[PDB]
Design a protein around this ligand. Structure first.
Ligand SMILES: N[C@@H](CCC(=O)O)C(=O)O
Lengths: 283, 274
């Protein structure tokens, strides 16, 4: 019975309360099919430095459908939980270094597999096994409709001031990316003061004119812009990256997880998930 | 430390030139050339190789710390399983003639059963090239799926024996059997067929098609959709199963992506005027 760790990240992972009886509300997809939901335990209010009260919740979305497909293909059972600290995972200095987020849970044995929109990168690949990518995407910039920014090389990003605020999500692949590239140090120092605990909080802050630009995954940002017409993406993709399933290096499932993902791209299953969860709406 | 590496010409990933040494952005690469067809005798002609994948190989050689003897495959091309035996670059790796295969080598499920692939280093998949304005939705378009429902039927093909034909054969049996009369011997023949009106569409590797549309004279030939890709995958370095080289090659490729070294290679080799 595999312990699966995930994270709230629409449209990949939706997280909703259970009904009073502890079951999940019956719903249908955009195509009329029943939505497959799983019980996922996790903390409720994610306020930093506070105690975490774990409660059963309902999880569904692209990554949950992918998990169900992996479980049926490879004949394994599982139990899903939401990452306790609500983060994707970075390695921070404490000489000693430690991993937080889903990366920390997988390496400590709190999870056996990460099934989420987890970016494949050098830093994490030294410690864990990533599958071949289940999604190819990159980074883009989300702004309020009307905000004029050319992209990553715009002077309001490259020569920053407190008049135009931009940020990413703390302890994420975007935070890793900006901290590693010396040429991005000017931007990293600006963002460090303004980074958000979660993508949802950052997206809301762009809608509320509290954050002028949010730098994040195009797979998420393009979805948000397709749903909220006051939100737009700007500029070409940069840091073209993919999402992969994460496992420990000694996992007996690693070869078959990657073969299953390749099979899914090739037979149209991955495109079926894009049509169900990602590309069905337009602004 | 000194590794036998196999490649295959496919511009701009691997471009072959005549040699009396290899200079500039080129590396030595040999090609076995037959003396005649009534002998097994041949000679290893010294040639020079360059391109996106050659630049990747140079970076890996330096970072991972290996030297190599690069050769061009002569038994087939990228890789096909024929009577259960792999030929092409895949075959060279399977049958341990090469430690690794570097080139425009698509990662797919059946190849991953016999070789280990590195992380993908170029995004690809299956795209469709048409003359600008051709109305085709994607691979699921009825003009492709049920071709004889149209009078006259749509004329489309691929270059057989690669990952694209294998995908079409497995997914769309009627389309596949219809298409084989439009098989193109190579990408250059297919582009000529499209430009002279002998073909309506050409289905092939997305990365090569995007590169060709980028350089098309007059920018007449385009890939359908927003440069739409079915069965998104990538090119990968093929290694022997259980290779001790995979771990460090993967970390190095991921380091290059993370340091923006891949975007530079894309600008240098792939982006076109169109
Ligand atoms: N890159 C392909 C060859 C071209 C194609 O079939 O699209 C392969 O590795 O087979």
């Amino acid at each position: 019975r595999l312990k699966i760790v995930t994270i709230h990240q629409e449209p990949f992972v939706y997280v909703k309360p259970t009904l009073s009886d502890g079951t999940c509300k019956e719903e249908f997809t955009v195509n009329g099919d029943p939505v497959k939901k799983v019980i996922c335990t996790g903390p409720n209010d994610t306020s930093p430095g506070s105690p975490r009260h774990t409660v059963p919740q309902c999880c569904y979305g692209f990554c949950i459908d992918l998990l169900i497909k992996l479980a049926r293909t490879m004949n394994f059972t599982y139990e899903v939980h939401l990452v306790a600290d609500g983060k994707f995972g970075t390695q921070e200095r404490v000489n000693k270094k430690e991993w937080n987020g889903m990366m920390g849970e997988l390496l400590s044995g709190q999870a056996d597999m990460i099934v989420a929109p987890l970016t494949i990168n050098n830093e994490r690949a030294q410690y864990i096994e990533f599958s071949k990518p289940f999604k190819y995407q990159g980074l883009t910039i989300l702004v309020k409709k009307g905000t004029r920014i050319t992209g990553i090389n715009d002077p309001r990003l490259r020569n920053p001031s407190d008049k135009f605020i931009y940020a990413t999500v703390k302890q994420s692949s975007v935070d890793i990316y900006f901290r590693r590239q010396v040429e991005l140090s000017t931007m990293y120092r600006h963002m460090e003061k303004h980074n958000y605990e979660s993508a949802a909080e950052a997206i809301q802050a762009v809608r509320d004119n509290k954050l002028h630009a949010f730098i994040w995954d195009s797979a998420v940002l393009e979805f948000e812009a397709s749903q909220k017409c006051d939100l737009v993406t700007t500029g070409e993709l940069f840091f073209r990256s993919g999402f992969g399933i994460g496992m420990r290096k000694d996992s007996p499932w690693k070869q078959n997880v990657s073969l299953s993902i390749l099979k899914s791209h090739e037979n149209g299953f991955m495109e079926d998930l894009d049509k169900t969860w990602v590309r069905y709406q337009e602004c | 430390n000194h590794l036998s590496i196999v490649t295959l010409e496919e511009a701009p990933f691997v471009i072959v030139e005549d040699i009396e040494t290899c200079v500039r952005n080129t590396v030595p690469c040999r090609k076995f050339v037959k003396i005649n067809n009534s002998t097994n005798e041949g000679m290893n002609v010294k040639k020079c190789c360059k391109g996106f994948c050659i630049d990747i190989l140079k970076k890996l050689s330096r970072t991972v710390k290996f030297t190599y003897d690069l050769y061009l495959v002569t038994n087939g091309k990228h890789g096909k399983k024929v009577n259960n035996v792999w030929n092409g670059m895949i075959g060279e790796v399977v049958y341990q003639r090469a430690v690794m295969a570097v080139g425009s080598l698509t990662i797919n499920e059946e190849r991953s059963e016999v070789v280990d692939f590195s992380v993908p280093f170029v995004e690809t998949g299956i795209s469709v090239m048409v003359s600008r304005g051709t109305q085709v939705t994607g691979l699921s378009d009825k003009k492709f799926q049920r071709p004889h429902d149209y009078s006259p039927p749509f004329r489309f093909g691929t270059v057989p024996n690669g990952s694209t034909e294998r995908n079409i054969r497995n997914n769309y049996p009627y389309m596949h059997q219809y298409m084989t009369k439009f098989n193109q011997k190579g990408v250059e023949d297919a582009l000529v067929s499209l430009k002279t009106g002998k073909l309506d569409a050409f289905i092939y590797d997305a990365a090569v098609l995007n590169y060709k549309a980028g350089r098309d004279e007059g920018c007449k030939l385009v890939t359908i959709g927003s440069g739409y890709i079915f069965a998104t995958t990538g090119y990968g370095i093929a290694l022997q199963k259980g290779s001790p080289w995979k771990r460090q090659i993967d970390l190095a490729l991921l380091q290059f992506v993370g340091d923006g070294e891949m975007e530079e290679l894309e600008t240098l080799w792939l982006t076109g005027i169109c």
